[PDB]
Amino acid sequence: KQYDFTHVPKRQGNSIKWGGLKEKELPMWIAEMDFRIAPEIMTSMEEKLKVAAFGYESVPAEYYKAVADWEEIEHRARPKEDWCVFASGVVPAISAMVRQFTSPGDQILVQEPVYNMFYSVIEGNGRRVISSDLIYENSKYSVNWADLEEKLATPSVRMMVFCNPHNPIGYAWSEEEVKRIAELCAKHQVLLISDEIHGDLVLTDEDITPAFTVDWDAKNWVVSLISPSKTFNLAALHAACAIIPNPDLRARAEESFFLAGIGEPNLLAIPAAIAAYEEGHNWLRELKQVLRDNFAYAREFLAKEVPEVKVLDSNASYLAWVDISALGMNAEDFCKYLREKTGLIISAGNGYRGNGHEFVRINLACPKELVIDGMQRLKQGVLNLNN
Amino acid sequence: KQYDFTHVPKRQGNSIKWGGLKEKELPMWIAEMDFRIAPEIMTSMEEKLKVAAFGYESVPAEYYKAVADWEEIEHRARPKEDWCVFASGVVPAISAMVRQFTSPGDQILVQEPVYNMFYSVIEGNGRRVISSDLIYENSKYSVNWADLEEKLATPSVRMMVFCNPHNPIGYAWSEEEVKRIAELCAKHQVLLISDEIHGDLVLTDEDITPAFTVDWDAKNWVVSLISPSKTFNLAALHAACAIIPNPDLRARAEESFFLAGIGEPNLLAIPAAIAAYEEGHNWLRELKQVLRDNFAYAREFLAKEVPEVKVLDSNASYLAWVDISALGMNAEDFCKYLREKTGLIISAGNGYRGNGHEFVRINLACPKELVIDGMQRLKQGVLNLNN
Numbered sequence: 025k026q027y028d029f030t031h032v033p034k035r036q037g038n039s040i041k042w043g044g045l046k047e048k049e050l051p052m053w054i055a056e057m058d059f060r061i062a063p064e065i066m067t068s069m070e071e072k073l074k075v076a077a078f079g080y081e082s083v084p085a086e087y088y089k090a091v092a093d094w095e096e097i098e099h100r101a102r103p104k105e106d107w108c109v110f111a112s113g114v115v116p117a118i119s120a121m122v123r124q125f126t127s128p129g130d131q132i133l134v135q136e137p138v139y140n141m142f143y144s145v146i147e148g149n150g151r152r153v154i155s156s157d158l159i160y161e162n163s164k165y166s167v168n169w170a171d172l173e174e175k176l177a178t179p180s181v182r183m184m185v186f187c188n189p190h191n192p193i194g195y196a197w198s199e200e201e202v203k204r205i206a207e208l209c210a211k212h213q214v215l216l217i218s219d220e221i222h223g224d225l226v227l228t229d230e231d232i233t234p235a236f237t238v239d240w241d242a243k244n245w246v247v248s249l250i251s252p253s254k255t256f257n258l259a260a261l262h263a264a265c266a267i268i269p270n271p272d273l274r275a276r277a278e279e280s281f282f283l284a285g286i287g288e289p290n291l292l293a294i295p296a297a298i299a300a301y302e303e304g305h306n307w308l309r310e311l312k313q314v315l316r317d318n319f320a321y322a323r324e325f326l327a328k329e330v331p332e333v334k335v336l337d338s339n340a341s342y343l344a345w346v347d348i349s350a351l352g353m354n355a356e357d358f359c360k361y362l363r364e365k366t367g368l369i370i371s372a373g374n375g376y377r378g379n380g381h382e383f384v385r386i387n388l389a390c391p392k393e394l395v396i397d398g399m400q401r402l403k404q405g406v407l408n409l410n411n
Numbered sequence: 412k413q414y415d416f417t418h419v420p421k422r423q424g425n426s427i428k429w430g431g432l433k434e435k436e437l438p439m440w441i442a443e444m445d446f447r448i449a450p451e452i453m454t455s456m457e458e459k460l461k462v463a464a465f466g467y468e469s470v471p472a473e474y475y476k477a478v479a480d481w482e483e484i485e486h487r488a489r490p491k492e493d494w495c496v497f498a499s500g501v502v503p504a505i506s507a508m509v510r511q512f513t514s515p516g517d518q519i520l521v522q523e524p525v526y527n528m529f530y531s532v533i534e535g536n537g538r539r540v541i542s543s544d545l546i547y548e549n550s551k552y553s554v555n556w557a558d559l560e561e562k563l564a565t566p567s568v569r570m571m572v573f574c575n576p577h578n579p580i581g582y583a584w585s586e587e588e589v590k591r592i593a594e595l596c597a598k599h600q601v602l603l604i605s606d607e608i609h610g611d612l613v614l615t616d617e618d619i620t621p622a623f624t625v626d627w628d629a630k631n632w633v634v635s636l637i638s639p640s641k642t643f644n645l646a647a648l649h650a651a652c653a654i655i656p657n658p659d660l661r662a663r664a665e666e667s668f669f670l671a672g673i674g675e676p677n678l679l680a681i682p683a684a685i686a687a688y689e690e691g692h693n694w695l696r697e698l699k700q701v702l703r704d705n706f707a708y709a710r711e712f713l714a715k716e717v718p719e720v721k722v723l724d725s726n727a728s729y730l731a732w733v734d735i736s737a738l739g740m741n742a743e744d745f746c747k748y749l750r751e752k753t754g755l756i757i758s759a760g761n762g763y764r765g766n767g768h769e770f771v772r773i774n775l776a777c778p779k780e781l782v783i784d785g786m787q788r789l790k791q792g793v794l795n796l797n798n
């Protein structure tokens with residue numbers, strides 16, 4: 025290993041994951057890593073600070089080239105550089121496109137259970153969430169394609185926020201899955217917002233199919249959203265990119281970003297994202313080895329010692345989605361009890377809606393010692409409910 | 412001098428002010444400085460990068476306490492910390508509050524000539540600009556109070572965006588003026604948005620009266636917006652703060668910031684803004700003397716060498732508002748010609764509406780060597796018109 029995946033970075037006091045924690049508490053909930061970032065990214069940030077003045081910045085061509093090269097090398101899918109639009113973050117970008125591309129009262133389709141912020145930005149903006157729930161049978165989720173299409177074909181359903189890879193279940197959709205969803209959207213004149221923030225984190229030999237790769241019958245109805253945030257542990261960098269093949273939709277999205285105040289990079293976003301996308305390949309390769317090892321440990325350990333929970337098969341993300349239905353306890357109550365009894369803090373599934381009240385979500389992007397600790401604490405919590 | 416005000420910071424290529432220039436061009440248009448930032452802010456950024464991991468961050472109580480301390484020490488006007496809400500930018504905060512507190516088609520009052528982004532955020536959001544124009548007589552601007560009140564009393568006039576100190580004329584309103592405008596707004600149930608981003612840059616012995624200091628007859632109708640960005644040359648830091656005494660308005664504004672994606676700090680906003688507001692007093696004191704020296708130089712040089720222009724008397728900001736009406740040329744025509752013939756790039760006043768076509772705006776926040784160069788180029792451009 026050329027990089028450090030053993031030492032937990034010591035945060036300042038306002039960290040959400042680590043701030044204000046009792047002693048020995050173990051946070052494994054919010055989706056950020058307990059690894060130092062790639063030193064090539066750190067080098068770029070430290071070089072930028074040498075300017076020692078931080079006035080207004082433009083988005084350089086080098087930024088879009090870096091995004092396009094990254095998508096080509098890592099995902100065999102090069103976007104055209106002119107498809108790319110900087111935004112300060114994925115969820116702010118979705119929020120702006122909700123306002124620009126739908127009207128108040130319109131419905132926006134998601135596939136529950138899904139990332140909670142999708143509901144916040146839809147409902148907070150005065151749009152209405154509609155779900156084609158994922159079907160859960162035999163420890164696997166699947167799409168009810170007829171229901172999905174009937175909902176997309178509804179006149180007031182105007183946008184689909186598609187989570188690709190899907191958070192929290194950790195599923196990188198197949199090529200014909202993505203192509204089918206895009207064709208359904210296009211046929212029914214629905215804009216497909218493809219949130220691909222987990223796209224660099226496919227752990228099997230499968231890979232992401234970005235929405236921008238679908239053929240031109242449908243490519244004019246898609247937006248791909250990417251960011252180095254999840255991949256490189258850079259949530260607070262506020263650097264993202266919308267990839268929008270449709271030139272007019274693209275320009276409208278850009279204008280909505282500027283009006284909302286999310287179209288201009290902060291003092292680090294451009295050099296740091298360029299460094300990640302140009303020089304982060306080796307660090308990501310080693311990261312995936314660590315994550316595969318951590319998932320292998322969690323799956324082997326919970327299969328052997330905690331048969332009352334079921335880690336779902338997932339091919340993407342560093343988040344494990346764990347069926348706790350056999351405990352007969354609402355996930356929020358269980359997570360509260362588990363924290364009080366063991367100090368382990370994991371995410372209750374309820375906020376993802378769908379059938380999330382039967383699940384917990386566990387963040388495995390930390391050093392293996394923390395994974396070993398956390399799994400034992402989860403075992404302790406499950407078996408002491410038995411008493 | 413303890414600090415460096417002679418060396419221009421060496422920017423990277425994607426700078427709005429210094430990027431894409433031709434040989435020997437001298438930019439003095441956009442409002443950012445050509446000074447290094449205070450070393451106390453610089454160190455806080457360098458130390459924060461050492462965390463080497465940038466996940467999610469809360470806004471700590473210490474941020475609002477630093478805002479309160481700064482306002483108390485610099486302006487003798489201590490806001491209650493509970494009034495304060497982080498936002499990533501002043502103009503984005505105005506944009507969010509336009510959408511939250513007015514309806515499409517409603518009128519929003521400004522005082523022309525005024526900062527061009529006021530028009531952008533009002534009209535881009537589908538609201539209508541109404542102006543109570545500042546009256547311009549004898550090289551000074553004044554308020555038509557009857558006209559202002561008549562417009563505020565119009566039912567469709569729902570918000571006033573108040574520039575305090577006023578850009579581009581560089582005028583810090585008197586206490587009586589701020590209180591009078593606030594009471595007019597409250598009397599007619601108009602929300603007063605007081606943009607105080609220039610409030611730390613009063614160059615005379617006068618000071619700003621922040622809107623949040625008005626008495627409670629009217630304090631429930633005001634929002635004060637502040638930021639270290641103008642004061643400390645931190646446009647790209649994306650740290651600002653709304654001060655909203657009314658708790659119901661405060662709750663609604665805070666939710667609007669979160670929905671727009673401007674309510675959460677990037678990786679540097681918190682420690683850098685805190686260092687600025689806790690340790691930037693001495694640097695700002697030295698900056699103000701450098702700015703006064705540059706304004707003194709420019710006024711004396713232009714009075715002696717270019718009597719065809721008149722630098723207006725101003726008490727705030729580092730932007731000179733220069734009456735070019737004696738040149739007999741539209742400011743946009745003059746500034747184009749000036750850049751072509753001399754390479755000096757200043758702002759045409761046309762974008763500020765009002766009587767801005769008779770003015771240019773010149774940024775004096777740069778080393779004296781650049782002020783001398785810029786003044787000579789401006790003289791040469793004036794000289795070459797009647798040749």
Ligand SMILES: Cc1ncc(COP(=O)(O)O)c(C=O)c1O
Pocket residue numbers: 055112113114115116139187191219221222251253254259264
């Ligand atoms: C599916 C998904 N989208 C978006 C985000 C957050 O993205 P950003 O912080 O750039 O807004 C997350 C959280 O990591 C996520 O899981």
Ligand SMILES: Cc1ncc(COP(=O)(O)O)c(C=O)c1O
Pocket residue numbers: 442499500501502503526574578606608609638640641646650651
């Ligand atoms: C009056 C005024 N308001 C707002 C701004 C922009 O501030 P921010 O970048 O924090 O949105 C400026 C830029 O100098 C300004 O002059």
